Amino acid sequence: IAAHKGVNQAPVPLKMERVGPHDVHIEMTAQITDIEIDKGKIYKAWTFNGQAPGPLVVVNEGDTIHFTLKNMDPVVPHSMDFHAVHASPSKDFIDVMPNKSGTFTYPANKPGVFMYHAGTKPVLQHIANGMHGVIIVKPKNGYPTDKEVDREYVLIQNEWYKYNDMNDFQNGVPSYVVFSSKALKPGDPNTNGDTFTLKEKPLLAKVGEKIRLYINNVGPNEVSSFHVVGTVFDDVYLDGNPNNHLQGMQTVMLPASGGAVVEFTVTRPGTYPIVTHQFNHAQKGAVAMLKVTET
Amino acid sequence: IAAHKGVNQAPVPLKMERVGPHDVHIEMTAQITDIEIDKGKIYKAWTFNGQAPGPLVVVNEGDTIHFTLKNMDPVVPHSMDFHAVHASPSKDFIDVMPNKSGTFTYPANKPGVFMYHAGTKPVLQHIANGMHGVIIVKPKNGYPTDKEVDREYVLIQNEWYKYNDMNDFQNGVPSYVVFSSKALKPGDPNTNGDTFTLKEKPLLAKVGEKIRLYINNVGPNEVSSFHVVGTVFDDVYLDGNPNNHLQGMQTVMLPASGGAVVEFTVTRPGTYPIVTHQFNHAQKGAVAMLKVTET
Amino acid sequence: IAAHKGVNQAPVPLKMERVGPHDVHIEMTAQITDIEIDKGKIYKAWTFNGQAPGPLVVVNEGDTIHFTLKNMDPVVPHSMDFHAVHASPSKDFIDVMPNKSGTFTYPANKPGVFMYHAGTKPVLQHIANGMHGVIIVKPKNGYPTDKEVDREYVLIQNEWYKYNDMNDFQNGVPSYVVFSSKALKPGDPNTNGDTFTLKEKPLLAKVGEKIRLYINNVGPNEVSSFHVVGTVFDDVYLDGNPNNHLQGMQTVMLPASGGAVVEFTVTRPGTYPIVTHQFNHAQKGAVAMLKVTET
Numbered sequence: 001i002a003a004h005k006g007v008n009q010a011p012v013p014l015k016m017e018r019v020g021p022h023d024v025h026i027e028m029t030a031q032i033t034d035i036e037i038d039k040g041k042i043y044k045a046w047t048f049n050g051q052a053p054g055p056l057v058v059v060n061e062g063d064t065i066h067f068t069l070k071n072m073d074p075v076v077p078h079s080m081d082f083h084a085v086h087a088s089p090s091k092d093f094i095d096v097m098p099n100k101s102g103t104f105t106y107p108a109n110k111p112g113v114f115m116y117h118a119g120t121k122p123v124l125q126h127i128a129n130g131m132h133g134v135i136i137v138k139p140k141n142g143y144p145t146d147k148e149v150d151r152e153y154v155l156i157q158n159e160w161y162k163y164n165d166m167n168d169f170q171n172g173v174p175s176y177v178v179f180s181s182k183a184l185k186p187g188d189p190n191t192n193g194d195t196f197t198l199k200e201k202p203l204l205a206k207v208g209e210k211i212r213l214y215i216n217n218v219g220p221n222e223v224s225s226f227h228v229v230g231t232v233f234d235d236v237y238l239d240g241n242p243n244n245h246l247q248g249m250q251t252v253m254l255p256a257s258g259g260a261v262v263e264f265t266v267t268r269p270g271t272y273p274i275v276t277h278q279f280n281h282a283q284k285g286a287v288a289m290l291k292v293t294e295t
Numbered sequence: 296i297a298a299h300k301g302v303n304q305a306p307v308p309l310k311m312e313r314v315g316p317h318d319v320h321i322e323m324t325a326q327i328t329d330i331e332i333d334k335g336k337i338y339k340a341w342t343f344n345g346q347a348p349g350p351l352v353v354v355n356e357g358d359t360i361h362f363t364l365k366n367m368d369p370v371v372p373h374s375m376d377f378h379a380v381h382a383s384p385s386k387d388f389i390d391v392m393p394n395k396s397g398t399f400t401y402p403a404n405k406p407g408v409f410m411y412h413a414g415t416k417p418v419l420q421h422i423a424n425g426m427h428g429v430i431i432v433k434p435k436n437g438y439p440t441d442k443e444v445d446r447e448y449v450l451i452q453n454e455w456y457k458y459n460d461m462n463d464f465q466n467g468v469p470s471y472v473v474f475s476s477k478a479l480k481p482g483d484p485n486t487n488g489d490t491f492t493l494k495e496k497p498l499l500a501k502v503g504e505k506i507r508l509y510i511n512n513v514g515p516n517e518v519s520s521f522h523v524v525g526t527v528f529d530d531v532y533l534d535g536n537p538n539n540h541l542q543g544m545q546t547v548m549l550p551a552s553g554g555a556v557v558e559f560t561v562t563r564p565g566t567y568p569i570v571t572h573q574f575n576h577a578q579k580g581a582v583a584m585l586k587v588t589e590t
Numbered sequence: 591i592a593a594h595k596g597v598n599q600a601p602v603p604l605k606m607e608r609v610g611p612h613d614v615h616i617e618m619t620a621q622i623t624d625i626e627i628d629k630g631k632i633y634k635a636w637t638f639n640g641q642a643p644g645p646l647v648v649v650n651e652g653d654t655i656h657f658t659l660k661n662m663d664p665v666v667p668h669s670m671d672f673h674a675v676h677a678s679p680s681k682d683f684i685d686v687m688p689n690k691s692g693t694f695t696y697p698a699n700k701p702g703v704f705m706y707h708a709g710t711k712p713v714l715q716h717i718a719n720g721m722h723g724v725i726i727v728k729p730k731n732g733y734p735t736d737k738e739v740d741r742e743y744v745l746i747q748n749e750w751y752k753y754n755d756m757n758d759f760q761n762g763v764p765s766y767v768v769f770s771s772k773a774l775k776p777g778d779p780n781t782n783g784d785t786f787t788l789k790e791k792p793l794l795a796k797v798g799e800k801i802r803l804y805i806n807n808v809g810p811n812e813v814s815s816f817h818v819v820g821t822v823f824d825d826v827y828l829d830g831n832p833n834n835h836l837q838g839m840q841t842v843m844l845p846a847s848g849g850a851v852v853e854f855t856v857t858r859p860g861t862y863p864i865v866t867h868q869f870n871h872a873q874k875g876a877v878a879m880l881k882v883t884e885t
C-alpha cells in the first residue's frame with residue numbers, strides 16, 4: 001500500500017485500568033509494524049499495539065470492558081471484535097477511521113480463553129495481516145483443578161501468508177504456522193508469532209510441576225491439533241469454560257478461533273516440544289519448546 | 296453430461312405424512328436443477344427436490360421412516376443415506392435407476408441433527424454436485440434448555456467446486472463456501488447454498504431472545520468452525536444429542552457431516568454475522584446475518 | 591536415497607513380553623520396506639517392523655514400558671515417541687543410529703488409544719514416510735459399556751504423499767488417504783495403510799452385535815471425520831479415556847494424532863462402509879468395509 005511504504009510504527013504498550021469492581025478500561029492502538037516472522041523475513045503487519053498476535057488482555061468474569069481503539073494507520077480503517085463479549089456487532093464492533101479513536105462498551109459474562117480480532121471487511125485480510133490476539137476471562141469460581149497447578153503460560157497459534165495477498169489468503173497454503181507466548185505475570189516472555197523465538201528461548205518449568213496453558217488457535221484458516229510431547233493432558237477445559245471438562249487427552253482439537261485451558265505434568269528433566277500435530281504446519285514453524293530443569 | 300444439457304427441472308415440494316404414532320412416509324425426488332450459487336454463477340446441481348442442500352426433514356425419536364426416492368435424472372442413478380437411521384447400507388441405501396422409484400424403510404432411534412446425502416459411487420461426486428441435506432430427529436424428552444429458547448432456525452454449511460470436476464472435488468480448494476437456511480415453521484426462510492441470500496435477507500430475531508440453531512456442516516470436504524459474532528453459545532449439544540452438553544463455547548468445531556444444536560442470547564439491537572471462523576471459507580461466501588430488532 | 595536403492599527389508603514380528611505385574615518389554619525395529627499403498631503403487635516406506643502404520647502395541651494402565659528400538663536402516667537415524675507415556679523427550683525419545691539399538695523406559699499411566707511415531711527431525715518426514723502406529727492402554731476399570739460389546743477391532747487412518755518429497759509433505763494435498771486394521775486377538779486381520787485391502791477383505795461381524803472400534807488418526811497432516819455408514823455411535827470415549835464420554839454421535843472429529851473408542855450396533859445383514867466423511871480423502875482411498883452376516 002503506498003501510504004504504508006517505509007512505515008514501521010514502534011510498539012505502544014497496552015493500557016488497562018480497573019474503574020469499578022466490575023468495570024475495566026482498555027486502550028489499544030491499531031498500527032503498522034515490521035515483525036520478523038521467520039529468520040530474514042519481515043512482514044509489515046497490521047497489528048494491535050505493534051504485536052502480532054496483539055497484547056494479552058485479562059479480565060474477570062462479569063467485568064464490563066470500556067474499550068478504546070486509537071487508529072494510528074494513515075489510511076486503513078480498523079475495528080475490534082472480542083469473542084468474550086455480548087455486543088451488537090453493527091454498533092459496537094465498528095470501524096475507527098485513520099487518526100481517530102472510538103470507544104465501545106460491553107460485558108464479559110462468560111469465563112474462558114477467547115479470540116479477539118479486527119472486524120473490518122474483509123475480515124480475512126485484517127486477521128491474516130496480523131489483527132488477532134486473546135482475551136482471558138477468569139472464572140468467578142476458578143477451575144476445580146486450580147489447587148494442583150504450579151505454573152501457567154499463554155500460547156497462541158496463527159498462520160502467515162504471502163504479504164497482503166488476498167488470493168493467497170483465500171486459496172493458498174500458509175507459508176508459516178507459528179506459536180507465540182503472551183505474559184500473565186512479571187517476568188513471563190512476551191513474544192510475536194514467529195518460527196523461532198520459543199525454540200531458542202524455551203518456556204521454563206521445574207521437574208514434577210503441573211503446568212497450565214491458556215491456548216487459542218486464532219487461524220485465520222487452519223484448525224489446530226494441539227499436543228505437548230512427553231506428556232498427556234490431565235485436564236482440559238474447552239474454550240476455558242470450567243464446565244467443559246475432559247481428562248487424559250493426548251491432543252486437543254481446536255477450531256479456528258478455538259481456545260482451551262490444558263493442564264499436564266512434566267515428570268522428567270529435559271526439553272518438551274509443543275506442537276500442532278498437523279505436521280505440515282509444525283514443519284512450517286509451529287513448534288514451541290518447554291525446558292524443564294531441576295530448577 | 297450430454298443428457299443434462301439444457302435440463303433444469305422445476306423444484307418439487309418434499310412430501311411427508313405420518314402413517315402411525317411411530318411411522319412416517321417421506322417422498323423425495325432426485326433431479327437436476329439450476330441453482331445460482333453466487334451472483335451470476337449457475338451450478339446445474341444434482342439435487343433432492345430441486346434444492347441444494349435438499350429439503351429439511353423432521354421426525355421424532357423412535358419414528359420409522361418409509362422413504363421413497365423418485366429418480367427424475369434422465370441418466371444418472373441416485374440413492375439416499377440418512378445418517379439418522381440404522382440400516383443395511385448395501386440393501387437400504389441402494390441406487391434408484393433413472394425414471395424409477397424405490398422405497399426403503401428404517402428407524403430413527405437417536406435424537407439429533409443428522410446429515411443425509413446420496414450414497415451412489417462416487418459418493419464425493421454426488422455430494423459435491425449438491426446431494427446433501429439435514430434430517431432432525433426431535434428428542435423424546437426435548438433438551439433441558441427447551442424452556443429458555445425463544446426462537447429457532449436451521450443452518451447448513453456446504454462447499455461448491457468447479458462444475459462436476461472430480462479432479463477439483465478431490466484436490467482443489469472450494470470455489471465457494473456457503474450457508475443456507477431450511478424452514479422449521481410457516482414463515483421461516485427456505486434457501487439454497489449460496490453466497491448472498493442470508494446476507495441480503497438476514498434471519499430475524501428480537502432483542503433479548505435466546506436463539507437456537509440446529510446446524511450441520513455437510514462438506515463435502517471441509518470442517519467448520521462455527522461462530523456467531525457478538526455472542527457466546529450458552530449451551531451446545533454435539534450432534535444434537537441432549538447428553539452431549541457443553542456450555543459457554545465461543546466457536547463450535549464441526550467435522551464434515553457434523554451437527555449441533557447451539558443456543559445463544561442476543562442482547563442488543565443490530566446485525567450479527569454468523570460465520571465459519573475459518574476465514575478463507577468465510578471470505579468465499581460462508582457468512583449469514585441475523586438481524587435483531589426491538590421487534 | 592542412494593543407500594535405500596533396492597532395499598526392501600522383510601517385516602520382523604513385534605516382540606513384547608511382560609516382565610512384572612506393572613512392567614512390559616517391547617522390541618521393535620526401524621526398517622525400510624516396500625508396501626503397496628494402492629494397486630500398482632509401491633512406497634518404499636520408513637517403518638517400524640516392516641508395517642505402516644507399525645504393529646499394534648497393547649499394555650495396561652500403570653504399566654512401565656522398557657522399549658528397545660533396533661535401527662536396521664543403513665543410513666537414516668530413527669527414534670520412537672509413544673503418546674501414552676510420560677517421558678523426557680530430549681532424553682527418552684532420542685535417535686538410535688544405523689545398525690545400533692537403544693532402550694528407553696517410561697510409564698503408561700493414562701488409559702486410551704494413543705499415536706506413536708518417530709521423533710527424529712524432521713518429524714514430518716518420518717511420519718509421512720510411514721513411521722506411525724497406535725498403542726492402546728487398557729483402563730484399569732474398563733469402560734462402563736464393556737458388558738455390551740460383542741466384537742472389537744482397531745482401525746488407523748493415515749495419508750501418503752509423493753515419495754519422500756518434503757515440499758509435497760508440507761504444501762501438497764495427500765495422494766492417498768487410507769485405513770488399516772491391526773490385530774487384537776488371534777484371527778484378526780493385520781493390514782497396512784492402503785486403498786484396498788479393507789474393501790476387498792472386509793472386517794466381519796454378526797447381525798445385531800455391538801461393535802467397538804479403537805481408532806486413531808495418525809495424519810501426518812489431516813483431521814478425520816470418522817463415520818460408519820448405516821449406524822450411529824451409541825457411545826464414544828475421546829482419546830479412549832473412559833471419562834470423556836459422548837453418546838449418539840453420527841461422526842467423530844479426530845485431530846491429527848487423535849484417538850477414540852467408538853461403539854455402534856449393526857442391526858441388519860449387509861456391507862457397512864467406514865469412512866472419513868471428508869469425502870475427498872474417502873475418494874483418495876479412506877473407505878473400509880464391515881461385512882455383517884447372520885454369521
Ligand SMILES: O=N[O-]
Binds near residue numbers: 227275277671713
Ligand atoms: O508429538 N510430536 O512429535
Ligand SMILES: O=N[O-]
Binds near residue numbers: 523
Ligand atoms: O468475525 N467473526 O467473528
Ligand SMILES: O=N[O-]
Binds near residue numbers: 376414817818819867
Ligand atoms: O457415505 N458415508 O456416509
Ligand SMILES: [Cu+2]
Binds near residue numbers: 021022
Ligand atoms: Cu460486586
Ligand SMILES: [Cu+2]
Binds near residue numbers: 019025066
Ligand atoms: Cu468507562
Ligand SMILES: [Cu+2]
Binds near residue numbers: 030077118120131
Ligand atoms: Cu485491521
Ligand SMILES: [Cu+2]
Binds near residue numbers: 081572
Ligand atoms: Cu471472530
Ligand SMILES: [Cu+2]
Binds near residue numbers: 316317
Ligand atoms: Cu407409542
Ligand SMILES: [Cu+2]
Binds near residue numbers: 314320
Ligand atoms: Cu409405509
Ligand SMILES: [Cu+2]
Binds near residue numbers: 325341415426
Ligand atoms: Cu446423486
Ligand SMILES: [Cu+2]
Binds near residue numbers: 376378410552867
Ligand atoms: Cu454419510
Ligand SMILES: [Cu+2]
Binds near residue numbers: 611
Ligand atoms: Cu500391583
Ligand SMILES: [Cu+2]
Binds near residue numbers: 609615656
Ligand atoms: Cu526391563
Ligand SMILES: [Cu+2]
Binds near residue numbers: 620636667668716
Ligand atoms: Cu524414522
Ligand SMILES: [Cu+2]
Binds near residue numbers: 227277673705707847
Ligand atoms: Cu506426536
